[PDB]
Design a protein around this motif. Structure first.
Motif, short mmCIF file in Angstrom:
data_model
loop_
_atom_site.label_atom_id
_atom_site.label_comp_id
_atom_site.label_asym_id
_atom_site.label_seq_id
_atom_site.Cartn_x
_atom_site.Cartn_y
_atom_site.Cartn_z
N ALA A 1 -80.74 22.47 -64.89
CA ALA A 1 -80.19 21.16 -64.38
C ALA A 1 -79.48 20.27 -65.54
N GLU A 2 -79.89 20.41 -66.71
CA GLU A 2 -79.30 19.78 -67.75
C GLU A 2 -78.04 20.28 -68.32
N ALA A 3 -77.85 21.41 -68.19
CA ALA A 3 -76.35 21.98 -68.40
C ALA A 3 -75.07 21.56 -67.11
N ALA A 4 -75.89 21.31 -65.79
CA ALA A 4 -75.17 20.90 -64.69
C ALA A 4 -75.06 19.58 -64.54
N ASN A 5 -75.75 18.77 -65.38
CA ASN A 5 -75.85 17.42 -65.45
C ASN A 5 -76.55 16.52 -64.15
N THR A 6 -77.40 17.40 -63.53
CA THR A 6 -78.00 16.93 -62.22
C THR A 6 -79.27 15.96 -62.43
N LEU A 7 -79.71 16.02 -63.74
CA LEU A 7 -80.78 15.05 -63.90
C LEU A 7 -80.49 13.58 -64.01
N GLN A 8 -81.14 12.77 -63.01
CA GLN A 8 -80.75 11.27 -63.11
C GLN A 8 -81.70 10.68 -64.10
N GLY A 9 -80.90 10.04 -65.03
CA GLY A 9 -81.58 9.01 -66.05
C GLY A 9 -82.28 9.87 -67.06
N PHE A 10 -81.83 10.86 -67.36
CA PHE A 10 -82.07 11.60 -68.47
C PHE A 10 -81.24 11.58 -69.81
N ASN A 11 -81.96 10.98 -70.86
CA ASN A 11 -81.55 10.89 -72.36
C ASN A 11 -82.01 12.02 -73.13
N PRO A 12 -81.69 13.04 -73.66
CA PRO A 12 -82.38 14.08 -74.17
C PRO A 12 -82.43 13.61 -75.78
N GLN A 13 -81.93 12.65 -76.07
CA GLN A 13 -82.22 11.95 -77.52
C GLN A 13 -83.76 11.20 -77.41
N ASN A 14 -84.25 10.81 -76.05
CA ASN A 14 -85.39 10.39 -75.90
C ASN A 14 -86.57 11.57 -75.95
N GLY A 15 -86.39 12.79 -76.06
CA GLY A 15 -87.25 14.09 -75.98
C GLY A 15 -86.82 14.66 -74.79
N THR A 16 -87.68 15.96 -74.52
CA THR A 16 -87.55 16.77 -73.42
C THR A 16 -87.99 16.00 -72.17
N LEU A 17 -87.64 16.88 -70.98
CA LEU A 17 -88.10 16.34 -69.62
C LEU A 17 -89.51 16.23 -69.62
N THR A 18 -90.00 17.30 -69.88
CA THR A 18 -91.47 17.69 -70.11
C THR A 18 -92.57 16.46 -71.02
N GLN A 19 -91.90 16.00 -72.18
CA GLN A 19 -92.21 15.12 -72.97
C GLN A 19 -92.04 13.53 -72.37
N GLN A 20 -91.11 13.39 -71.71
CA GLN A 20 -90.56 12.21 -71.28
C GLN A 20 -91.35 11.78 -69.90
N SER A 21 -91.69 12.87 -69.11
CA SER A 21 -92.41 12.80 -67.71
C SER A 21 -93.97 12.60 -68.02
N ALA A 22 -94.32 12.37 -69.15
CA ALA A 22 -95.52 12.24 -69.51
C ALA A 22 -96.16 10.80 -69.86
N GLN A 23 -95.04 9.94 -69.82
CA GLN A 23 -95.17 8.54 -70.01
C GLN A 23 -95.35 7.80 -68.60
N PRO A 24 -96.47 6.90 -68.60
CA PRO A 24 -96.48 6.43 -67.27
C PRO A 24 -95.28 5.63 -66.60
N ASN A 25 -94.25 4.96 -67.27
CA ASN A 25 -93.26 4.32 -66.63
C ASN A 25 -91.96 4.87 -66.37
N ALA A 26 -92.07 6.38 -66.78
CA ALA A 26 -91.06 7.41 -66.34
C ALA A 26 -91.10 8.17 -65.28
N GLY A 27 -91.53 7.32 -64.13
CA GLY A 27 -91.78 8.01 -62.82
C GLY A 27 -90.52 8.65 -62.04
N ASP A 28 -89.31 8.40 -62.42
CA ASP A 28 -88.15 9.02 -61.85
C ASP A 28 -87.86 10.25 -62.52
N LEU A 29 -88.03 10.41 -63.76
CA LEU A 29 -88.08 11.76 -64.44
C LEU A 29 -89.16 12.70 -64.03
N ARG A 30 -90.32 12.14 -63.90
CA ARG A 30 -91.62 12.83 -63.65
C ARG A 30 -91.50 13.38 -62.23
#
Length: 115
Positions: free
Chosen positions: A70-99
């Motif tokens: 998904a990352e290679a295909a650019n299909t994730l919406q609102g994903f900035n890899p500089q703020n950490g992995t999808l797993t790490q970012q999905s753990a934060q309350p306000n990150a509902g769209d990534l989660r």
């Protein structure tokens, strides 16, 4: 925590006579995910109830490849890899769209199990 021990036991009892990756099994999880909004950690706890270690291993290998695809295909919406992995970012309350995207990939990865 997204689920209480009773809710984990209930999800488990409903899918015990269902094969991982089958329609009812996936649909029960889809419904539980929608109702509780689990983080990657809640999902990891749920896996201890519903999946044998052999299935967890196959699932997590399938999910890791799907995140990378998904990352290679650019299909994730609102994903900035500089703020950490999808797993790490999905753990934060306000990150509902990534989660919500993690939860979808976590769910689809159960269909794609080598059999």
């Amino acid at each position: 925590r997204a689920w209480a021990l009773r809710e984990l036991q209930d999800i488990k009892k409903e899918i015990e006579n269902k094969a991982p990756g089958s329609q009812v099994w996936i649909q029960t999880l889809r419904l539980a995910i929608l109702q509780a909004d689990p983080t990657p950690a809640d999902l990891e706890q749920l896996c201890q109830y519903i999946a044998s270690p052999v299935d967890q291993t196959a699932h997590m290998t399938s999910l890791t490849a799907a995140i990378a695809a998904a990352e290679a295909a650019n299909t994730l919406q609102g994903f900035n890899p500089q703020n950490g992995t999808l797993t790490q970012q999905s753990a934060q309350p306000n990150a509902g769209d990534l989660r919500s995207q993690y939860q979808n990939l976590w769910l689809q990865a159960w269909k794609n199990l080598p059999t």
